[PDB]
RNA sequence: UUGGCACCUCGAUGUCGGCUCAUCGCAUCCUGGGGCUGUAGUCGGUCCCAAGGGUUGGGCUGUUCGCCCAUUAAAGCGGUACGCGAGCUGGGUUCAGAACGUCGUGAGACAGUUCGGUCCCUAUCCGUCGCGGGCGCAGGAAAUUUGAGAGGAGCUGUCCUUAGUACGAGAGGACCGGGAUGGACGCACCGCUGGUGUACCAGUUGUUCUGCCAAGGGCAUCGCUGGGUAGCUAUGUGCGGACGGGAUAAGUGCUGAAAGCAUCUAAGCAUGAAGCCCCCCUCAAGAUGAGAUUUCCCAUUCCGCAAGGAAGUAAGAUCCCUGAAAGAUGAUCAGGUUGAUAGGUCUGAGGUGGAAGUGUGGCGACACAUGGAGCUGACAGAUACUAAUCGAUCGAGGACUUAAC
């Protein structure tokens, strides 16, 4: 199977639609911020409700 | 569970030793025949003095399988050796005795002579 | 499986003694020919005990006329009338499916009456 | 269900027998995420044998704990550390011995690291 | 035609009256509450919504909290119609339960089948494997699409897909017993749908 | 089909036959229904309608075909690039090797035969089969739907009665109609029968290791067996093609004319098929003709005098997390501390089947007791003990002409 005819410059961009990556769910640490991501321990201070676990 | 080409040892004094299936009789059709199911067969090996000889095409009837007989009451009958009893055009058998134990489901078929000729109908 | 169970707490048959796999018990089987009820004896070696409450099973196996008869049965079914335990047995294992081969002395030698 | 972890059924046993030992020495490990969530199901069985302390109970636990000296200068094996230290601490607790805290992903492969601590 | 709906639990063996052995399901379907009477004077057709297996208030919404106000009971998860009962003998708020059925009522039963996941051409359609030896590389696969001249695949040529997840009626069952003490049905045979799924136990179309 | 012609293709259109997967045409093999019979019943010949469904397991040969074995309601033809090689097999023809007969003086030749002889491709597009993300459906939302339309199913054999009845010299043997039971095919599921089950349990060989014994670990396909729960399942079990309704084909007609009688037809009314349309089951309002009913949240704050535009927000949802009956990922579904969603811990169920250790019998290998003991993967029911914290993002203000209010 060999591609019978080249993809034009429209169809090439129309598969880039869902190809976009997305935001991370991000909030701030109530210790420091800014910012954390959701439910996982920050690199900022390393507190997580709220023990200072480095 | 006795389909085409299944060598069934015989269980009577009719002369035969090993019976080869050809075609289970029911329908278009089927490929299995558990217990009490009439088969068209030949005889591959025989005790040497016998009216049914080697290479003769005479029908037969299963009695036992290593496959189960499933009674409708939970209990299951399953033997350790396959079987045949050989029939001559009506359900009176050509054989004289019928060796070994016998699945009792034959009596619920039309084989009431075959049950009477056989020692442990269980 | 509690509410599975407590339905069938009623018909849990409670007129038989317990038994291990490797032993011999007699079964009293109610058997219909038309129209009466022979209570035919049944005899031989127990093997299987595939469990499950009402769904339990057991297999008495009987050599007869040189031929083995593998026969299962219900653990609480009403057709089994009475159970008479003849032998017990020191048996190493709990599923004796090897003796659907072994005839006949070494089957008997593994029937050590404990 | 259980987790295949991309390892053969013997490779997983050598996988899990190492990590359960390393919680005994370290008190905390930074594995990957499904190396964390799948480790808590074993250690909370393994600490459960610690509370017994039978001569039979220790000989079950030696098949998931290796032979590694845990504390220097006392020469304690990780087998000894369960029945001496850990079981003397968890006679209050009934389950949930190791809480798992997720950390961010790792650089070189994007793998979600995760922190296990006993508690 | 009467019909109630509910969860199932599993399979059992219940012997009865003979030496028999019956393959029996266990159904949780009591009790249903009439939430809304679909009427042909407004909607054209005749039906009754029934709700089942009430849930706690965190799981229920204000559009649906007010929907149970005509029956005046707790919010309730599983809602379906039933076209169409003998009209009516029902009032919105009457707790329909097991008491209708008996040992002898022939019953059709519908439910959403056990989804097995993305399965190939043999398992999804009963298609047959090719030769596993003799140098043949074609096995496990659906094979020839169609002819050459129409230059396309005819719609309906079976292919791999996601097997399961439909709703399946299975007909002509026999309800064994009635347990209004424990809210339990008992139906001969196999009933579609996985463990703890929802199952509508109708009355059949006979005879 | 063998052909004629050479008009697509010799900068390549893979040729025979099998395996899969089919559809379609009926000029019909059955099954449904009828005329005639050189049809007494039974079984036929033959001509009609009828494609809905079924249309087998071999032996032989590369074979299609063909014959034969035995069944069967029957074992239909035929097209679709003599269907189907970017789906497979090369057994033959027609690569080189190699022989045999024949022919030629010889190289070699032969639709004359025979043994051996690299069958390549990551799927671009349209198709097909499943899954999603937008948007629309004159405000946003949550449930349940209706059905225009789309599919699936559509096969039948026995047996017993009716009835040894009609029929028949007799032999032989019913029509119609009921009732039980199969075959094949299909749709489900695991309670039994089983299979499997690589973190379940027991035994065991070699070596290696925890100082040694005892006890265990490693590796040998999981070292090897013998068992096995949950799940996936078939050969296992349950169900299916039912009863119907409505118009029709070929028939069969009742009336009646033209053509005083006659005449199924021209006006008029019927009956009649496994055919058609529904009933049975599945999808389904993207059905832009965007349907329906129930219950919700409301009708903000600012700019633009205005048309309009933003920002904050309710009903609800989404990100994020624990997962599973779901599952490729998305999705669905159970759930997020007025919590059982998952793991653990208990109490169990099933599985394995008598733990270590101790004492005793035995010189010993081993047995016996403590003791259905010990060990347990997803299987059940409790328990906040652990992880589902924090929080964020999205989402309305309902155009206007007319009719009735």
Curated annotation (Swiss-Prot), chain A:
A GO MF label:
structural constituent of ribosome
Q: Which Gene Ontology cellular component annotation is one that this UniProt entry carries?
A: large ribosomal subunit
Matching entries from InterPro entries are given as:
Ribosomal_bL32 (IPR002677), Ribosomal_bL32_bact (IPR044957), Ribosomal_zn-bd (IPR011332)
Per the record, the GO terms for biological process are: translation
Coiled coil ranges (UniProt) are none
Q: What keywords appear on the UniProt entry?
A: Ribonucleoprotein, Ribosomal protein
Q: How would you summarize the oligomeric state and partners of this protein?
A: Part of the 50S ribosomal subunit.
**Family, as annotated:** Belongs to the bacterial ribosomal protein bL32 family.
Q: Which PANTHER family match?
A: 50S RIBOSOMAL PROTEIN L32, LARGE RIBOSOMAL SUBUNIT PROTEIN BL32
Q: What is this protein called?
A: Large ribosomal subunit protein bL32
Swiss-Prot record, chain C:
Among its keywords, does the record have Ribonucleoprotein? yes
Q: Which UniProt keywords apply?
A: Ribonucleoprotein, Ribosomal protein
InterPro entries xrefs = Ribosomal_bL19, Ribosomal_bL19_CS, Ribosomal_bL19_sf, Translation_prot_SH3-like_sf
Per the record, the GO terms for biological process are: translation
Q: Which Pfam families match?
A: Ribosomal_L19
Record GO terms (molecular function):
structural constituent of ribosome
Q: Which domain of life is it from?
A: Bacteria
Its GO CC terms are: cytosolic large ribosomal subunit
**Annotated family:** Belongs to the bacterial ribosomal protein bL19 family.
Checking PANTHER family in the record gives: LARGE RIBOSOMAL SUBUNIT PROTEIN BL19M (PTHR15680:SF9), RIBOSOMAL PROTEIN L19 (PTHR15680)
Which NCBIfam families does the protein's record reference?
A: rplS_bact
Subunit (UniProt) = Part of the 50S ribosomal subunit.
Q: Which HAMAP family match?
A: Ribosomal_bL19 (MF_00402)
Stated name of the protein: Large ribosomal subunit protein bL19
Q: What organism is the protein native to?
A: Bacillus subtilis (strain 168)
UniProtKB/Swiss-Prot annotation, chain D:
Which Cys-Cys disulphide bridges does the record give? none
Please, one GO biological process term? translation
GO cellular component, alphabetical, reads: cytosolic large ribosomal subunit
Q: Which Gene3D superfamilies match?
A: Ribosomal protein L17
Keyword Ribosomal protein on this protein? yes
Domain of life of the organism in this record? Answer: Bacteria
Q: Name one GO molecular function term.
A: structural constituent of ribosome
Q: Does the keyword field hold Transcription?
A: no
InterPro entries attached to this UniProt entry:
Ribosomal_bL17, Ribosomal_bL17_CS, Ribosomal_bL17_sf
User: HAMAP family given for it?
Assistant: Ribosomal_bL17 (MF_01368)
What does the sequence similarity comment in the record state about its family? Belongs to the bacterial ribosomal protein bL17 family.
Stored NCBIfam families = L17
- Oligomeric form and interacting partners: Part of the 50S ribosomal subunit. Contacts protein L32.
> Record's PANTHER family?
LARGE RIBOSOMAL SUBUNIT PROTEIN BL17M (PTHR14413:SF16), RIBOSOMAL PROTEIN L17 (PTHR14413)
Give the protein name, as stated in the record. Answer: Large ribosomal subunit protein bL17
Which species is this record about? Answer: Bacillus subtilis (strain 168)
From Swiss-Prot, chain E:
Q: Which GO terms describe its cellular component?
A: cytosolic large ribosomal subunit
Q: Name one GO molecular function term.
A: rRNA binding
Any GO BP annotation: positive regulation of rRNA processing
| Gene3D superfamilies associated with the record | 3.30.160.810, Translation factors (2.40.30.10)
A Pfam family per the record = Ribosomal_L3
What InterPro entries does this protein map onto? Ribosomal_uL3, Ribosomal_uL3_bac/org-type, Ribosomal_uL3_CS, Transl_B-barrel_sf
Q: Which UniProt keywords apply?
A: Ribonucleoprotein, Ribosomal protein, RNA-binding, rRNA processing, rRNA-binding
Ranges for region Disordered: 121-151
What assembly does the database describe for this protein?
Part of the 50S ribosomal subunit. Forms a cluster with proteins L14 and L19. Interacts with RNA helicase CshA.
What the protein does?
One of the primary rRNA binding proteins, it binds directly near the 3'-end of the 23S rRNA, where it nucleates assembly of the 50S subunit. Strongly stimulates 23S rRNA precursor processing by mini-ribonuclease 3 (MrnC); 20-30% DMSO can replace L3, suggesting the protein may alter rRNA conformation.
Q: What family does the entry list?
A: Belongs to the universal ribosomal protein uL3 family.
- Put simply, this protein is called Large ribosomal subunit protein uL3
Species name for this entry? Bacillus subtilis (strain 168)
